[PDB]
Paper text:
Cyclodipeptide synthases (CDPSs) use aminoacylated tRNA (aa-tRNA) substrates to form peptide bonds between two amino acids yielding a cyclic dipeptide product (CDP). ParaCDPS from Parabacteroides sp. 20_3 (GenBank: EFK64745.1) produces cyclo(His-Phe)8 whilst ParcuCDPS from [name] (GenBank: ETB63777.1) can synthesise both cyclo(His-Glu) and cyclo(His-Pro)9. ParcuCDPS belongs to the XYP sub-group of the CDPS family, characterised by the presence of 3 residues: X40 where X is a non-conserved residue, Y202, and P203 (numbering respective to AlbC). ParcuCDPS displays a Rossman-fold common throughout the CDPS family.
Author numbering: 1 to 4, 10 to 60, 70 to 230
């Protein structure tokens, strides 16, 4: 389990976030645990564990995920960690729920995306196509009202992937993830302003989240 400048991680200049995709088959407890091992070694100081995407007891879909499943996932993770790591390692690990991340400043960026999603048909159309591709991987089908529902849900997590955000007071500049996805490619074009440049102009600050590709 090693990372795919190069010298910045081996200079341990960044705090590392472990972005978990709930329900993704790769994110077993063992792989999560190995991602936490790697991050504790290479981090500046803290390791942040959080729920990244999710591909009605709340008006927020990420908040809904957090309370239906993210809680019990975090509990299993804490159990495993308390057996696999020493006391001094565990004090470096922060469990960040959706609420910890989606403070007032964060929600402003989401609402900007929501606004763009309704007023700008090309953004809506492009976001909608994202969902339609993910559906086609499945043996399930979805209607256009569902496809459009799930596109809004991406916008809710889109700022955390692009911008450096605090959680429980802690800015984490980098996050580990085992593979490139259509999402990480899109975020890279956004950050560079190569696609939908009004997004960069509005909700980015040239403090881009560093994506570290770490897998076995």
């Amino acid at each position: 389990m090693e990372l795919h400048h190069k010298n910045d991680i081996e200079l341990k200049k960044y705090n590392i976030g472990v972005a978990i995709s709930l329900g993704n088959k790769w994110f077993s407890i063992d792989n999560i645990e190995k991602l936490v091992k790697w991050s504790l070694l290479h981090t500046k100081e803290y390791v942040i564990i959080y729920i990244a995407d999710s591909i009605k007891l709340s008006d927020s879909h990420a908040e809904e995920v957090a309370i239906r499943y993210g809680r019990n996932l975090f509990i299993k993770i804490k159990e495993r960690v308390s057996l696999s790591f020493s006391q001094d390692e565990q004090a470096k690990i922060i469990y960040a729920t959706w609420s910890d991340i989606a403070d007032s400043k964060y929600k402003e960026k989401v609402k900007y995306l929501y606004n763009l999603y309704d007023k700008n048909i090309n953004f809506k159309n492009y976001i909608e196509n994202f969902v339609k591709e993910w559906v086609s991987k499945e043996k399930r089908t979805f209607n256009n009202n569902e496809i459009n529902k799930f596109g809004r849900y991406i916008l809710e997590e889109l700022p955390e992937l692009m911008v450096q955000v605090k959680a429980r007071g802690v800015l984490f500049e980098a996050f580990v993830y085992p593979y490139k996805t259509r999402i990480t490619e899109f975020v890279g074009l956004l950050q560079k302003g190569e696609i939908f440049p009004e997004i960069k102009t509005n909700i980015l600050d040239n403090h881009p989240k560093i994506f570290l590709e770490v897998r076995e």
